[PDB]
């Protein structure tokens, strides 16, 4: 149900020239069709001198290594659904010298050949998860006046930094959507000694992540600290699960009865946490 | 014999015989090794549709 095409070339003029052995490995739960490989092998103008297949793992022995783009493809069938999304592996070994190999990575047709990481610096971090909370408690029925915001921030599942941020523009880098934006007020922080108003902060979210964030609006952001830093010095922060995002209402959106005394409670929380900070 | 001296060191050789003394220092440096294959290069592309379980 899935088609494959391995491709091989050799730079040459090194002295290593000769036959090569391929170690292409399919995804989980796949296995190639023996008939297709046999048909490729049986031809007089043969490129696959020998083949062998046991489930996912398929070997390809090449008698001649072309210098330019000249390669061969086949087909594989699935029988068990894959439990995750990740790139797979593929390796080529020189026939007379297995040490001088070449490992290469490949991913799903709609996915990338590398994982989503933001490290880009001396420290390194990675960004797998479910990004968008897209929570608006005022327009729905789950909001309460109990005051669990402090519980969420300082007790469980615990939150590090505190900011309310006004969005400037929406940007996209690699598989990540960058939100260039301006700080309005600093609520709390753990390590950002440079925290202040009218500063530059960058918030990043995966492109696959279906979060919607309209530029020009003021959003409330709460989450765990990042470790990547911007190109101009400011620490950059990442959007993922356990990240709290909200859009505050307006006066016309706070006087109304379906959020009466709840929007005011949220503003009181914001002021109290900005002033007092966490307790116990 | 091993020693732990991170600064300039002194020598006070004494003896009628003559010989060769050499010192080895081991440390890490800024890496420059290429991450891309140099002699043989393999690229594989997969096309089609893949079924997956409940994720994303």
């Amino acid at each position, epitope marked *: 149900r899935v088609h494959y095409t391995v491709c091989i070339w050799r730079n040459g003029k090194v002295g290593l020239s000769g036959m090569a052995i391929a170690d292409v490995t399919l995804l989980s739960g796949f296995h190639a069709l023996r008939a297709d490989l046999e*048909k490729l092998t049986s031809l007089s103008d043969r490129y696959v001198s020998h083949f062998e297949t046991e489930g996912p793992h398929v070997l390809l022995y090449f008698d001649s290594v072309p210098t330019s783009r000249e390669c061969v493809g086949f087909e594989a069938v699935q029988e068990v659904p894959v439990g995750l999304v990740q790139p797979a592996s593929a390796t080529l070994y020189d026939y007379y010298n297995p040490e001088r190999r070449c490992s290469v990575f490949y991913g799903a047709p709609s996915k990338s050949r590398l994982l989503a990481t933001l490290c880009s610096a001396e420290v390194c971090q990675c960004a797998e998860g479910k990004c968008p909370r897209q929570r608006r408690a005022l327009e729905r029925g789950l909001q309460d006046e109990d005051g669990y915001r402090m519980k969420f921030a300082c007790y469980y599942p615990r939150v590090e930094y505190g900011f309310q941020v006004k969005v400037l523009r929406e940007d996209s880098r690699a598989a990540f959507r960058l939100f260039e934006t301006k700080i309005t007020q600093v609520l709390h922080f753990t390590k950002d000694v440079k925290a202040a108003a009218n500063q530059m902060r960058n918030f990043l979210v995966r492109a696959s992540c279906r979060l919607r964030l309209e530029p020009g609006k003021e959003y409330l952001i709460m989450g765990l600290d990042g470790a990547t830093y911007d190109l101009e010095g400011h620490p950059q922060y990442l959007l993922d699960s356990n990240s709290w995002i909200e859009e505050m209402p307006s006066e016309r959106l706070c006087r109304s009865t379906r959020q009466r005394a709840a929007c005011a409670q949220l503003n009181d929380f914001l002021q109290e946490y900005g002033t007092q900070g966490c307790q116990v | 014999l091993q020693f732990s001296l991170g600064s300039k060191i002194n020598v006070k050789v004494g003896g009628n015989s003559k010989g060769t003394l050499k010192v080895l220092r081991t440390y890490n440096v800024l890496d420059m090794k290429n991450t891309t294959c140099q002699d043989l290069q393999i690229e594989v592309t997969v096309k089609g549709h893949v079924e997956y379980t409940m994720e994303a």
Partner: nanobody
Amino acid sequence: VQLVESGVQAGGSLRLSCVASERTYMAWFRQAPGKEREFVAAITSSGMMTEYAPSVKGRFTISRDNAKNTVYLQMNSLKPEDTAVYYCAADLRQRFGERVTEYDYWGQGTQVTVSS
């Protein structure tokens, strides 16, 4: 390894057959006069998966026979601007989806005309 192909008011249905000596994955290409040749669709050796040109999504279907070693292409709902010579050709390396023209031993084709 030779290709034999054999087989009109607009909006109808049509059936062109291409037969090959060897069980292979021959696709179909079209060439209108005054312009370079382009593909319409393709199929693998097994025949359980196909591909179609973006202008003919959901309108044309390729089928293959296990015994007679041929291909079944149906042209229901003909388009008036679909008149060209249609070719059937392949290679021997199972390089499916090889859209740019590096197929060998191209068939000699059949002109088909569409009248409005």
